[PDB]
Design a protein around this ligand. Structure first.
Ligand SMILES: [Zn+2]
Ligand SMILES: [Zn+2]
Lengths: 113, 120, 95, 54, 72
RNA sequence: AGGAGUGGAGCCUGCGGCUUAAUUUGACUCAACACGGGAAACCUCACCCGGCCCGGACACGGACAGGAUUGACAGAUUGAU
RNA sequence: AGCGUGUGCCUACCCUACGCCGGCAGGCGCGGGUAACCCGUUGAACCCCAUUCGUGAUGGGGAUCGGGGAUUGCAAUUAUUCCCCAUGAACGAGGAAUUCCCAGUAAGUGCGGGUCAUAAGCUUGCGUUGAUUAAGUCCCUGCCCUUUGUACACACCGCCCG
């Protein structure tokens, strides 16, 4: 069964709000910036942005499979339809979502404000 | 004594779907939707208190929370005690209250007598 | 919780290494583990037992619980259910 | 205590719905299928796409 | 300091204890030296607990523990 | 300069006082008082009267398979299978 | 008329045309609509046109109450709402005091949304009918700038003298 056009665009929003808040709570101390969800007829692609991507995937892509197995099981839509990437933010000293988590990590490690 | 033009003795053997045509609309609808699982077990308790009561003696007081129990005409004479939030208050069922709820006989509040007004 | 609950919760932990929940004590049964009749309270308290030992890693969200598996938690499932290391979970499947 | 505790019929009414991120029951926006608190909607509004125009 | 012990704990709301006689199978079984198996209590005819799981024998009834079947 | 009024009346809803087992509570000039999106039958529920449950992780010592809790018909007890 | 809403992850919970039965509140089927496709030409209310009433606590006004009937719910008694009879109070344009407002405005008049199992005297939007007066001042209440008096500055709710 399909759904209304008014509901489909609002339920589309609450997906990317919970996804983004979950990934904030997860990778806030890994320099996470945002997500970018592109939907193909084959799959739904989720592009994670981060400062250092190569310390996010784990080793040879170990942490990326736990994340794409959680986000399949939470939002229910089946296997082989979701897949996570990890691209890098271009100018790290511009986006304020990387500069508040760097500043929190600087403060937590005992540095004067 | 009667009720809508029929004495209590025919009400004691008035059937379930025919007594419903004498009641008012809340009570008729309530008997249409059914008496639930914890309301059949109250009438059984009042039968068990009635046929073990002595023939010159009214039965002992029985404690309930069921303030929504309709006073059926097969429930006359019993000593039920319906709660008021604090205490179980003693109720004796008379035949003239056979369309009311049980929970309008334990008052739920202290009827107010005022004092001197303070700083208004 | 009985054996066919506490065992069956641990079975799908080794399969893919992650488990989600709802923080819903009052749920009749967990939706991933149908045909077993394990409530959500059972899997919730099982992972609450596993987190204090250090076998899983907790993360919360809006409403749902999330749990990953640490390296010393793989061996705790490897001997509790007696598996050989010749099989692998989903760690070393793609790339 | 099996036919008991989660026994009471929560099939409607104010305390069968709760916020989907707060799990709080007061000030709830059910319109368009949001089901958020009135406070947690205001945090995530620009993420959903509700822009304040006028 | 900065507290009072108050001695006001009243947990006296006694629960039960599981009174089991030593190897209650001897209450269940009785065997003579020829080798007869005299099951002194009834066996429940249910599908789940048939032919192995024994009932209770009260003062006026039979009684199960699995499906709590009752007789007279 | 005016218009509609409000303040008088009935009622609806807030807030004080009184009352109460409890009448949960925050807010007191504009910048508290149809405000808490607060139109509470139950739930909401905090408050009052009574009762059940652990949903007390984990670490340590005892009980410990002449056992540890568990579950359960009837009878009494109970608001209450 | 105009803004709108409509079958929902957990989640039960709807917008409803049309035929029949009912004074009516409603009840049965039977279709449409995940919507510029259906309710819907959204056949709104004041407004407009005819009959009756005739300055009186009247047919204005409807409070408060006695009987029934019907939906919602697990539950309607301390009345959930709704329908029908009956009862028919205060109130005769409001003291001291005080609020809002400059044009499609005030005011009237309905309609949607939120709340919503049940439900708007609230709020938030929308239309429809649609004016009087003003195009000015610092009198009041306040805000501000410049000169200027201060023995004030947890700052006139100040500091202080018998
Ligand atoms: Zn919330
Ligand atoms: Zn058995």
């Amino acid at each position: 069964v399909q759904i209304s056009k008014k509901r489909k665009f609002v339920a589309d929003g609450i997906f990317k709000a919970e996804l983004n808040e979950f990934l904030t709570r997860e990778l806030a101390e890994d320099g996470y910036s945002g997500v970018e969800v592109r939907v193909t007829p084959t799959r739904t692609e989720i592009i994670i942005l981060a400062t250092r991507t190569q310390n996010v995937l784990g080793e040879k892509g170990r942490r990326i499979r736990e994340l794409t197995a959680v986000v399949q099981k939470r939002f229910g839509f089946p296997e082989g339809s979701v897949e996570l990437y990890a691209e890098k933010v271009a100018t790290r000293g511009l986006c304020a979502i990387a500069q508040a988590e760097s500043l929190r990590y600087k403060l937590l490690g005992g540095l004067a404000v | 004594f009667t009720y809508r033009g029929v004495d209590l003795d025919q009400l004691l053997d008035m059937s379930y779907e025919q007594l419903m045509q004498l009641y008012s609309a809340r009570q008729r609808r309530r008997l249409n939707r059914g008496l639930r699982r914890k309301q059949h077990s109250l009438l059984k308790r009042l039968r068990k208190a009635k046929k073990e009561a002595p023939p010159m003696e009214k039965p002992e007081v029985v404690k309930t929370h069921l303030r929504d129990m309709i006073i059926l005409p097969e429930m006359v004479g019993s000593m039920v005690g319906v709660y008021n939030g604090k205490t179980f208050n003693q109720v004796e069922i008379k035949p003239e209250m056979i369309g009311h709820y049980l929970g309008e006989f334990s008052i739920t509040y202290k009827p107010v007598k005022h004092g001197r007004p303070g700083i208004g | 919780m009985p054996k066919k609950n506490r065992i069956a919760i641990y079975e799908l932990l080794f399969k893919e290494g992650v488990m989600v929940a709802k923080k819903d004590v009052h749920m009749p049964k967990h939706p991933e583990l149908a045909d077993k009749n394990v409530p959500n309270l059972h899997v919730m308290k099982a992972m609450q037992s596993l987190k204090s030992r250090g076998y899983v890693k907790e993360q919360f969200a809006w409403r749902h619980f999330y749990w990953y598996l640490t390296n010393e938690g793989i061996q705790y499932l490897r001997d509790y259910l007696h598996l050989p290391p010749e099989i692998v979970p989903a760690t070393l499947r793609r790339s | 205590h099996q036919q008991l505790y989660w026994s009471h019929p929560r099939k409607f009414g104010q305390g069968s719905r709760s916020c989907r991120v707060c799990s709080n029951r007061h000030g709830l926006i059910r319109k368009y299928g949001l089901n958020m608190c009135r406070q947690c909607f205001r945090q995530y509004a620009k993420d959903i796409g509700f822009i304040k125009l006028d | 300091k900065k507290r009072k012990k108050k001695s006001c704990t009243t947990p006296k709301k006694n629960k039960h204890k599981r009174k089991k006689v030593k190897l209650a199978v001897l209450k269940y079984y009785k065997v003579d030296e020829n080798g007869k198996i005299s099951r002194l209590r009834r066996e429940c005819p249910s599908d789940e607990c048939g032919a192995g799981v024994f009932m209770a024998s009260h003062f006026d009834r039979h009684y199960c523990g699995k499906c709590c079947l009752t007789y007279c």
